[PDB]
Design a protein around this ligand. Structure first.
Ligand SMILES: OC[C@H]1O[C@@H](S[C@H]2[C@H](O)[C@@H](O)[C@H](O[C@H]3[C@H](O)[C@@H](O)[C@H](S)O[C@@H]3CO)O[C@@H]2CO)[C@H](O)[C@@H](O)[C@@H]1O
Ligand SMILES: CC(=O)N[C@@H]1[C@@H](O)[C@H](O)[C@@H](CO)O[C@H]1O
Ligand SMILES: *[C@@H]1O[C@H](CO)[C@@H](O)[C@H](O)[C@H]1NC(C)=O
Ligand SMILES: *[C@@H]1O[C@H](CO)[C@@H](O)[C@H](O)[C@H]1NC(C)=O
Length: 606
């Protein structure tokens, strides 16, 4: 269709499937295996990307061009990599992925939204969609085209370090929150075929339903471990939200490090190809987790040739290597040259990768848009995060006896108030893991508003606000305070570092609450990724709020404390009486919660 030098795959007016087939038919084996290879930015250079025909790059958690990098620094990084990829013989653009899992959370100055457990507390799928919309914009601000989200794990044991990445122990809530997908990618057309990939264009991102399947069902919440459940339970609890993701056109699916009845997901042909591809009719691409193929073996990485065979034959399309690309490419080439992996499997993987890249517009807009840089941390997005944070809060207690005056909402005008606790003026702690660093961090790590700063911004000008991180009882009794707001809870964590069998918060936390509440009426704000042992905190406190990991906009917390809005959040998980009960989920025969799933007290706006 025209010029002498016309190449059909480069023609934007042609159907995606025609462009895929036209390009596939031109590729060498090295070109094909290169599309299946994703590498870390830390190992990428122009020559590596060209010479190995690389298909994708990622930033792992904390993998940034430099601390404090601007949106344009990110765009320039990504474009540098893309220029190299575009300079190959076929000029296939790379796709760049990142964990934008509560905002564009690796990036300094990005809006940090509540983590998923708090989002579940909102029961507001439209809010979550709008969060997906804002997050796409902040990701494209940085030149990145692909977010490894949503995590649609259904966490069945809060001892898991990734429980905060699950919207709920109730699959029905997780299913509802799959609205993140069309937020991130755009809404699918009216005609759309379930399982096809979809991204609207250059102002949206490819999404990733993860981690397939039963990541949230592992024994004792041990991360990456075995999920022991019959097929009926897998399909009833862990699978449903993947079908909603198909219906919404999720572009990619990432495989779980976990096993199902002792079979590594990364080696599970029956589920990856038999179920996801052949039964759900998924037509986007399937990506490994980080060194997920390595971890098929024990020790990990001890037979990488077998890891490559098993994973590729199972149906994986793209391998998050992410470092040892030369070994991956060599081994895979060897297996194909040997007949161990058929060209048909290679061609299927490449068809799927290309289908996503053409669908999303990546061949038409391979480079960043500098005009999008100002989306990063935009105030409209922060207002959205503030709404989400406030909606996420679950009021557990509001008065020690039935006859007491309710403590919340608090008055904005009082002579002197106390704000205390380890978590009252610590932005990193209120964001939790996957913020700036992989594991999160402590202190003022990005742009945001701490609880203390929020209180100062809310109160009447006549109200004196005193901060004391860990005051003793006498200090409180002597201070002439009207009330105190005390914030405590978990430190940031991610993945296996968060696995925790006792679920008690670090000290000083309880001791501070006890000292404060012992001297003045107190509202305790509990920052956590999950339910934690709470009876002692409750016994001490007049009011207690489960604020989860509310992100960068601490004013969401004070919006509800001071009565600008009423408390509306409801527990998305069971709150256990003790960890010896676990696992214990809504609907179990032996259900004895401290607070059941769906519990939450309310207030009315002042
Ligand atoms: O981020 C991509 C997908 O990967 C994993 S998280 C992944 C971190 O992103 C990555 O930084 C981290 O690398 C560490 C290795 O685990 C360690 O074994 C070595 S010593 O060092 C680096 C620490 O720099 O590895 C993590 C996986 O363990 C998630 O499961 C996915 O949800 C995420 O999309
Ligand atoms: C009361 C108690 O023992 N708490 C522990 C804490 O010391 C430890 O860091 C964590 C690791 O999982 O588990 C919990
Ligand atoms: C589960 O973790 C145990 C305890 O660390 C370990 O020995 C085992 O290999 C793990 N199982 C799987 C399937 O990951
Ligand atoms: C809050 O509003 C509800 C619904 O009208 C009402 O029934 C309740 O009495 C109100 N409580 C307070 C403290 O204002």
């Amino acid at each position: 269709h025209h010029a002498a030098d016309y190449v059909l795959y480069k023609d934007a007016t042609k159907p995606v499937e025609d462009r895929v087939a036209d390009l596939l038919g031109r590729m060498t084996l090295a070109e094909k295996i290169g599309q299946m290879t994703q590498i870390e930015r830390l190992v990428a250079t122009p020559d590596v990307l060209r010479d190995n025909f690389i298909g994708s790059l990622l930033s792992g958690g904390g993998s940034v061009p430099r601390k404090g990098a601007t949106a344009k620094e990110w765009q320039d990084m990504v474009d540098g990599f893309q220029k190299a990829c575009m300079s190959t013989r076929l000029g296939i653009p790379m796709i760049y992925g990142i964990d934008a899992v509560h905002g564009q959370n690796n990036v300094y100055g990005a809006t940090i939204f509540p983590h998923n457990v708090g989002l579940g507390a909102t029961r507001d799928p439209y809010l979550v969609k709008r969060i997906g919309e804002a997050t796409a914009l902040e990701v494209r601000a940085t030149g990145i085209q692909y977010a490894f989200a949503p995590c649609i794990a259904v966490c069945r044991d809060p001892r898991w370090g990734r429980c905060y990445e699950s919207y709920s122990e109730d699959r029905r809530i997780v299913q509802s929150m799959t609205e993140l997908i069309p937020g991130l990618q755009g809404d699918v057309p009216k005609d759309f075929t379930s399982g096809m990939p979809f991204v609207a264009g250059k102002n949206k991102v490819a999404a990733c339903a993860k981690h397939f399947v039963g990541d949230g069902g592992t024994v004792d919440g041990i991360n990456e471990n075995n999920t022991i459940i019959n097929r009926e339970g897998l399909m009833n609890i862990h699978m449903p939200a993947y079908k909603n993701a198909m219906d919404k056109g999720v572009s990619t699916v990432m495989i779980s490090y976990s096993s199902w009845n002792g079979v590594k997901m990364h080696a599970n042909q029956d589920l990856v190809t038999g179920y996801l591809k052949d039964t759900l009719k998924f037509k986007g691409f399937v990506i490994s987790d980080w060194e997920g193929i390595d971890r098929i073996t024990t020790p990990a990485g001890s037979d990488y040739s077998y890891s490559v065979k098993a994973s590729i034959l199972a149906g994986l399309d793209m391998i998050m290597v992410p470092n040892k690309y030369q070994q991956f490419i060599s081994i895979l080439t060897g297996h194909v040259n040997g007949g161990v992996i058929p060209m048909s499997r290679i061609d299927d993987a490449v068809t799927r990768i290309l289908r996503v890249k053409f669908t999303m517009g990546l061949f038409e807009n391979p480079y960043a848009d500098p005009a999008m840089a100002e989306q990063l941390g935009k105030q409209e997005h922060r207002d959205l995060a503030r709404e989400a944070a406030r909606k996420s809060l679950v009021l557990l207690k509001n008065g020690k006896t039935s006859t007491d005056a309710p403590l919340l909402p608090l008055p904005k005008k009082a002579p002197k108030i106390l704000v205390a606790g380890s978590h009252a003026d610590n932005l990193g702690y209120q964001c939790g893991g996957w913020t700036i660093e992989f594991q999160g961090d402590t202190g003022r790590t990005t742009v945001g508003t701490t609880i203390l700063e929020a209180v100062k911004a809310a109160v009447d000008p006549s109200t004196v606000v005193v901060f004391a991180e860990n005051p003793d009882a006498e200090f409180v009794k002597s201070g002439g305070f009207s009330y105190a707001i005390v914030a405590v809870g978990e430190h940031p964590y991610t993945e296996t570092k968060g696995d925790n069998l006792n679920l008690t918060i670090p000290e000083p936390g309880l001791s501070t609450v006890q000292a404060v509440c012992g001297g003045v009426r107190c509202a305790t704000v509990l920052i956590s990724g999950r339910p934690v042992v709470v009876q002692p905190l409750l016994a001490a406190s007049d009011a207690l709020v489960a604020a989860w990991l509310p992100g960068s906009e601490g004013q969401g917390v004070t919006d509800a404390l001071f009565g600008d809005f009423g408390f509306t959040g409801r527990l998305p998980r069971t709150w256990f009486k003790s960890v010896d009960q676990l696992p214990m989920n809504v609907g179990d025969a032996h259900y004895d919660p401290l607070f059941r799933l769906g519990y939450g007290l309310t207030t009315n706006a002042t």
